[PDB]
Amino acid sequence: GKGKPRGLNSARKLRVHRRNNRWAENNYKKRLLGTAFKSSPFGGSSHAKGIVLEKLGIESKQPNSAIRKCVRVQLIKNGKKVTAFVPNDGCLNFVDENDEVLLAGFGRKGKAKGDIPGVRFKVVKVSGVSLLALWKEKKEKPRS
Amino acid sequence: MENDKGQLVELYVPRKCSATNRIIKADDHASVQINVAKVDEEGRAIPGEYVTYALSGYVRSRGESDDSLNRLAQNDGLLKNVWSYSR
Amino acid sequence: GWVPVTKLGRLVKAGKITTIEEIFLHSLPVKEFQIIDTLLPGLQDEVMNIKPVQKQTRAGQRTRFKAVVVVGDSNGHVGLGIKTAKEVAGAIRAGIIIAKLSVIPIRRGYWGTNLGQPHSLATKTTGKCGSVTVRLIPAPRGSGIVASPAVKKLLQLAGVEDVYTQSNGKTRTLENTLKAAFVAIGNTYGFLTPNLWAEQPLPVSPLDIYSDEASAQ
Amino acid sequence: PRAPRTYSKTYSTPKRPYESSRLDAELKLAGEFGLKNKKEIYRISFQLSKIRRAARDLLTRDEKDPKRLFEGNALIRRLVRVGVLSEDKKKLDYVLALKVEDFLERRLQTQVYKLGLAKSVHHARVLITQRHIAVGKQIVNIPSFMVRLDSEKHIDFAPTSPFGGARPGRVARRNAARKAEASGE
RNA sequence: ACCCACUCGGCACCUUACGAGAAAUCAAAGUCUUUGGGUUCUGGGGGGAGUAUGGUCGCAAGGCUGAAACUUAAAGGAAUUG
RNA sequence: AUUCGGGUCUUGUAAUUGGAAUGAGUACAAUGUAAAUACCUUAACGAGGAACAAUUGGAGGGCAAGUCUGGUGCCAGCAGCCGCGGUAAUUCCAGCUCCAAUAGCGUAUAUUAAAGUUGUUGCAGUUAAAAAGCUCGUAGUUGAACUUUGGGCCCGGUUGGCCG
Ligand SMILES: [Mg+2]
Ligand SMILES: [Mg+2]
Ligand SMILES: [Mg+2]
Ligand SMILES: [Mg+2]
Ligand SMILES: [Mg+2]
Ligand SMILES: [Mg+2]
Ligand SMILES: [Mg+2]
Ligand SMILES: [Mg+2]
Ligand SMILES: [Mg+2]
Ligand SMILES: [Mg+2]
Ligand SMILES: [Mg+2]
Ligand SMILES: [Mg+2]
């Protein structure tokens, strides 16, 4: 009988069963446990300013070796350290240390056989200037 | 199958099986048609007059084609005391 | 030119069978694609997919081609064929031969009311192949053909106008998808709807009215 | 604390974004009629769609039911005043069969080129937005005016306009002044 | 006691498929997009992990209940060729 | 068309020409307005527009678009996912080109669809994740059949025909 109660006065069993079963969904669990407000470095917001703690030369090997020009940034609101990508920039002449940096999300999945990890953030702004505009030589950078 | 103007609008009214009243369809290469010969008093069969039956590929595969033919024929005057309505 | 080799082919070349409707009515098995050619002049093909396939024959590695090809009137006739050959245009050729062969009718009917020509399907149908199911549902007129690209082409080339689909399974394998869809339209003429209840008198086969003709020499 | 000024979107972006067939269909549609955005097309597709919905929702109900009668007849006569639906097709089942071009063919833009006041369609654009082209006593400067049927037989040039009558434009009297002053000299 | 015919109830086997299935195979794993005979339990990518924490049962070994951060693009099924 | 030429049409052009059009902007006035700003009106100006100069993302696949030149190859197979090489690269960098949506377009987080991957409608559970070792048993869900059917009469409605 397709293994679920099908009776007309059976609602309670049905909906209760559904509630107990929604905890295997992933996002639902994130959403009722307040994982976003308790653990996620961004605290459940689309962006975060942080200050560059240390310029990182991570090296992520397989299948393609990234001379990972990344950063250790510490988020201002959490005092929470994070690693973050700084895109399109060959020399990193744009981002120095002690610099305020607006971060966003970034979806690079890490890989196993070459110990490449998944940073989750990309620099969007440095010192108030857009990484892009600098890179387009459109706007210049106030250096303090 | 008609439209509003009262005119038929199909590709074809298809052949129904005689035992099973189900439709025989175009890709059914196990379906079959049986011509049985109308006979004269002189025991000659006329060249162009048949009692014909249709059989779905289903019934022939299932091995009921025979018994079906029997009943059908017997009821349509061809045989007598071959097929019982009771078993 | 073409020489028939089948007592259905000589019947055709001698113009003793006008339409395919006479093939289909009596389920007479086609084996000579030229039959379909003469009976369906306005048949427009379409290569759905071409795929490099790696053969390994007795330590001799080769590269061949798998082609999925659809054909059809934009009235009521479809055909689908898959073929693997050694050369692309050869594959396509052979594919069209095969799909020519397996041509099927279609019952296309009305949604609710009854004006003009039949536009959609007659009833809900379903084909399954592999893991894939494809379901086809009558739409109202002007609802277009609601299906993914492949299945949409197959239905267009079959003179369907308005039809909702629902698939299921790994629809990413286009050959199973196409096959299944194919089945689902190829079931329409197979669902006994009440307007087909009225008993007909059994027609007498082309094979017997013209039997002296198209008989082997 | 006001009433909140209601408002709504007008169009709808396609579901599959890159679809070589739809792409082309759209382009030829913009071409016949000189549209500038695909958006202009979408807007039509969308109105169309709302009509096809009202249509079906009426269709599923019983004939000779007050609602299907009322809203049916309304939708029908509305579609007829703009001459999207022809005089003979005055029953719901056709308003479903309606397509986009049936709407695209009643634009002021279009009717200006089909009443031959313009040389090409693009010419009709320019001529409309140029405040040249009146419908009766009104000027109209929107390419999407959607001409009702009883307003077809009134469209002409503007009594304000250089072609309609009046004095020549700024360029014209500019060159008139140039030649007259160059000859006086 | 045996033999033949039948009969309920078992027990395995051998065929097939109308049917199901991803396939191996299945008289149910069928009567399922043509989706609803009644009901119980369980699962929701792989790891982290039957781990941590709490509660409970046990003399103990342990059992039952049972996470999260974090990590990862596969892990897996069946079948096919060499 | 026998060949020149008789004309219809549609195109590619040429930073070619010609004369039309017009509001962006500027501005008397008036209108508007509690007073103004603006809109709508309108004298007067106001482009060939070699700049009243349009962008944002892309061009291996998904996914629309490169069979283009040089550089690389010490700042280099490379970062949503998967691809792909190195004298000669459509797959990286720069230019050229092209594509998409366009006064807007990209990106991040959330959320709905996709997702029949929460399944009442509608999943799955032999081997892919998953039938409690097994039975008993309360709540719970679920529960065989049967008790005025059948016949006769009359009344008046709302669609549909053949007549008007
Ligand atoms: Mg699916
Ligand atoms: Mg898990
Ligand atoms: Mg005033
Ligand atoms: Mg660009
Ligand atoms: Mg790419
Ligand atoms: Mg792409
Ligand atoms: Mg492409
Ligand atoms: Mg599932
Ligand atoms: Mg296992
Ligand atoms: Mg298992
Ligand atoms: Mg068990
Ligand atoms: Mg009861």
Q: Which residue bears the tokens 């890490």?
A: A110
Round to whole Å and give the CA distance between B51 and D5.
80
DSSP B56-77: -HHHHHTT-HHHHHHHHHHHTT
Round to whole Å and give the CA distance between C94 and C81.
9
Helix axes C149-156, C174-185, angle to 10 degrees: 40
Q: Which residues of A48-87 are buried (b: 16+ CB within 10 A; e: fewer)?
A: bebebeeebebebeeeeeeebbbbbbebeeeeeebbbbbe
Token pair in block for residue A115: 């110990």
| Interstrand relation of C132-138 and C145-146 (parallel, antiparallel or unpaired) | unpaired
> Does the distance separating the beta carbons of C116 and B15 come in below 8 Å?
no
Round to whole Å and give the CA distance between C39 and C15.
10
Vertex D55 angle, CA D53 and D60, to 5°: 100
Instruction: Quote the ligand 3 centre to D124 CA distance (angstroms).
Output: 39
Query: Cα dihedral sign for D113, D116, D117, D120?
Result: positive
Named by the residue before each, gaps in chain A exceeding 2.5 A from C to N are: none
Say which ligand is closest to the CA of D23.
7
Q: Which residue in chain C has the smallest CA separation from D60?
A: C112
Q: Which residue in chain D has the smallest CA separation from C110?
A: D93
Round to whole Å and give the CA distance between A119 and A121.
6
> Does the distance separating the beta carbons of D93 and C141 come in below 8 Å?
yes
Round to whole Å and give the CA distance between D14 and B43.
76
Q: Which residue bears the tokens 């894939």?
A: C132
Q: Which helix (H) or strand (E) holds D48?
A: helix D39-59
Q: Which residue in chain D has the smallest CA separation from C146?
A: D15
Residue D140 lies in a domain: yes
Tell me the H-state helices in chain C: 9-13, 21-25, 34-39, 88-101, 149-156, 174-185, 206-209
Strand order in the sheet with C60-72: C44-57, C60-72, C78-85, C103-104
- Please check whether residue A144 is in contact with residue A96, taking contact to mean a CB–CB distance below 8 angstroms: no
Token pair in block for residue C84: 């693997």
Count of structural domains, chain D: 1
Cβ count within 10 A of residue C205:
17
Q: Is A44 left (phi over 0), alpha (psi -120 to 50) or beta?
A: left
DSSP C204: P
Residue D1 lies in a domain: no
Round to whole Å and give the CA distance between A8 and A96.
68
Q: According to CATH, where is 3.30.160.20 located in chain C?
A: 1-105
Shortest Cα–Cα distance, D16 to chain C (Å): 10
> Does the distance separating the beta carbons of C189 and B25 come in below 8 Å?
yes
- Please check whether residue C7 is in contact with residue C196, taking contact to mean a CB–CB distance below 8 angstroms: no
Token pair in block for residue C14: 């001698």
Q: Is the peptide bond before A63 cis (omega within 30 degrees of 0)?
A: yes
Round to whole Å and give the CA distance between C28 and C20.
10
Residues whose CB is less than 8 angstroms from the CB of residue C185 and which lie 6 or more positions away in sequence, other chains included: C78, C104, C106, C125, C127, C136, C154, C155, C158, C160
What is each CA distance from C25 to B2, B56, C36, D34, in whole angstroms?
19, 13, 15, 51
Residue type at A39 in one-letter notation: S
Instruction: Quote the ligand 7 centre to D168 CA distance (angstroms).
Output: 53
Token pair in block for residue D13: 């972006």
What is each CA distance from A30 to A82, A107, A120, in whole angstroms?
20, 18, 17
Instruction: Quote the ligand 8 centre to C128 CA distance (angstroms).
Output: 19
- Please check whether residue B59 is in contact with residue B17, taking contact to mean a CB–CB distance below 8 angstroms: yes
3-state secondary structure D76-111: HHHHHHCCCCCHHHCCHHHHCCCCCHHHHCCCHHHH
Chain C CB contacts of B12 under 8 Å are: 21, 24-25, 105
Domain extent at residue D155: 17-185
Q: Which nucleotide is closest to the Cα of D27 by its C1'?
A: F100
Round to whole Å and give the CA distance between A121 and A128.
17
What is each CA distance from B60 to C7, C24, C29, C30, D152, in whole angstroms?
24, 20, 17, 21, 70
Token pair in block for residue D57: 């929702």
Q: Which residue bears the tokens 């689909």?
A: C165
Token pair in block for residue C62: 């080769």
DSSP D152: G
Q: Is A84 left (phi over 0), alpha (psi -120 to 50) or beta?
A: beta
| Interstrand relation of B45-55 and C44-57 (parallel, antiparallel or unpaired) | unpaired
Chain D CB contacts of C115 under 8 Å are: 91, 93-94
Q: Which of B9, B12, B35 sits opposite C25 (nearest CB)?
A: B12
Q: Which helix (H) or strand (E) holds D128?
A: helix D121-129
Strand E positions within 7 A of protein Cβ atoms: 17-18, 21-23, 32-34, 36-45, 68-74, 81-82
Cα D61 from chain centre: 32
Chain C CB contacts of D88 under 8 Å are: none
How far, in Å, is the CA of D40 from the C1' of nucleotide F10?
27
Sequence-distant contacts of D151-160: CB under 8 A, at least 24 apart? D152/D83, D152/D111, D152/D115, D155/D108, D155/D111, D155/D112, D155/D115, D155/D117, D156/D117, D157/D117, D157/D132, D157/D133, D158/D131, D158/D132, D158/D133, D158/D134, D159/D134, D160/D131
Cα B52 from chain centre: 6
Alpha carbons within 13 A on the beta-carbon side of A40: 18
Round to whole Å and give the CA distance between C83 and C45.
14
Residue C113: exposure state from Cβ atoms within 10 A (0-12, 13-18, ≥19): middle
Protein residue closest via CA to C1' of F119 = A18
Named by the residue before each, gaps in chain C exceeding 2.5 A from C to N are: none
Q: Is A45 left (phi over 0), alpha (psi -120 to 50) or beta?
A: beta
Q: Which residues of C39-68 are buried (b: 16+ CB within 10 A; e: fewer)?
A: bbeebebeebeeeeeeeeeeeeeeebbbbb
How far, in Å, is the CA of A78 from the C1' of nucleotide E28?
61
Q: Which of D19, D60, D99 sits opposite C142 (nearest CB)?
A: D99
Residue closest to D112 by CA, chosen among D130, D128, D101, D131? D128
Round to whole Å and give the CA distance between C71 and D64.
45
Query: Would you tell me which residues 37-56 of chain B have a C-beta closer than 8 angstroms to some C-beta of chain C?
Result: 50, 52-54
3-state secondary structure chain A: CCCCCCCCCCHHHHHHHHHHHHHHCHHHHHHHCCHHHHCCCCCCCCCEEEEEEEEEECCECCCCCECCEEEEEEECCCCEEEEEECCCCCCCCCCCCCCEEEEEECCCCCECCCCECCCCEEEEEECCEEHHHHHCCCCCCCCC
The size of chain A, in residues, is 144
- Please check whether residue A33 is in contact with residue A74, taking contact to mean a CB–CB distance below 8 angstroms: no
What is each CA distance from D43 to D7, D27, D38, D142, in whole angstroms?
15, 15, 9, 15
Round to whole Å and give the CA distance between C145 and D14.
15
Strand F positions within 7 A of protein Cβ atoms: 19-23, 41-42, 45-47, 57, 63-65, 75-84, 99-103, 107-112, 116-121, 123-125, 131, 140-143, 159
Round to whole Å and give the CA distance between C12 and D172.
76
Token pair in block for residue D64: 């000779």
D56 has a chain C CB within 8 A of its CB: yes
Q: Is D160 helix (H, G, I), strand (E, B) or coil?
A: coil
Count of structural domains, chain A: 1
Q: Which of residues 76-105 of C touch strand E (CB under 7 A)?
A: none
Round to whole Å and give the CA distance between A87 and A124.
9
- For D96, list phi and psi in degrees, rounded to 5: -75, -40
Token pair in block for residue B84: 């019982």
Alpha carbons within 13 A on the beta-carbon side of D141: 6
- Please check whether residue A57 is in contact with residue A92, taking contact to mean a CB–CB distance below 8 angstroms: no
Beta bridge partners of C63: C54
How far, in Å, is the CA of A23 from the C1' of nucleotide F118?
9
- Please check whether residue A83 is in contact with residue A133, taking contact to mean a CB–CB distance below 8 angstroms: no
Residue type at B56 in one-letter notation: S
Instruction: Quote the ligand 11 centre to C183 CA distance (angstroms).
Output: 40
Round to whole Å and give the CA distance between C157 and C77.
8
Beta bridge partners of C83: C67
Residue closest to D49 by CA, chosen among D84, D108, D98, D4? D98
- Please check whether residue A49 is in contact with residue A100, taking contact to mean a CB–CB distance below 8 angstroms: yes
CATH class as words, domain C106-199: alpha beta
Domain C1-105, CATH number (from 3.30.160.20, 3.20.20.70, 3.40.50.300, 3.90.1720.10): 3.30.160.20
Shortest Cα–Cα distance, B34 to chain C (Å): 10
DSSP D9-35: ------SSS--HHHHHHHHHHHHHHT-
% helix, strand, coil for chain C, step of 5: 25, 25, 45
Residue D164 lies in a domain: yes
DSSP C200: P
- Please check whether residue C203 is in contact with residue C26, taking contact to mean a CB–CB distance below 8 angstroms: yes
Residue C125 Cβ < 7 Å to strand E? yes
Q: Which nucleotide is closest to the Cα of C176 by its C1'?
A: E22
- Please check whether residue A84 is in contact with residue A48, taking contact to mean a CB–CB distance below 8 angstroms: no
Residue type at C81 in one-letter notation: G
3-state secondary structure A64-85: CCECCEEEEEEECCCCEEEEEE
- Please check whether residue C86 is in contact with residue C65, taking contact to mean a CB–CB distance below 8 angstroms: yes
Beta bridge partners of C85: C65
Residue A44 Cβ < 7 Å to strand E? no
Alpha carbons within 13 A on the beta-carbon side of D174: 3
Round to whole Å and give the CA distance between D93 and C113.
8
Site from B5, B17, B27 to mutate, C interface, most C CB atoms within 10 angstroms: B27
What is each CA distance from C204 to B33, B68, C24, in whole angstroms?
9, 21, 13
Q: Is C70 helix (H, G, I), strand (E, B) or coil?
A: strand
Ordered by where they begin, the domains of chain B are 1-87 (3.30.1230.20)
- Please check whether residue C130 is in contact with residue D86, taking contact to mean a CB–CB distance below 8 angstroms: no
How far, in Å, is the CA of A41 from the C1' of nucleotide E69?
12
Q: Which residue bears the tokens 């060959």?
A: A90
Q: Which of D56, D91, D99 sits opposite C140 (nearest CB)?
A: D56
What is each CA distance from B65 to B72, C29, D59, D68, in whole angstroms?
10, 21, 47, 53
Q: Which residue bears the tokens 């709504």?
A: D8
Q: Which of B2, B9, B52 sits opposite C202 (nearest CB)?
A: B52
DSSP C205: P
Residues whose CB is less than 8 angstroms from the CB of residue C95 and which lie 6 or more positions away in sequence, other chains included: C47, C67, C68, C69, C81, C82, C83
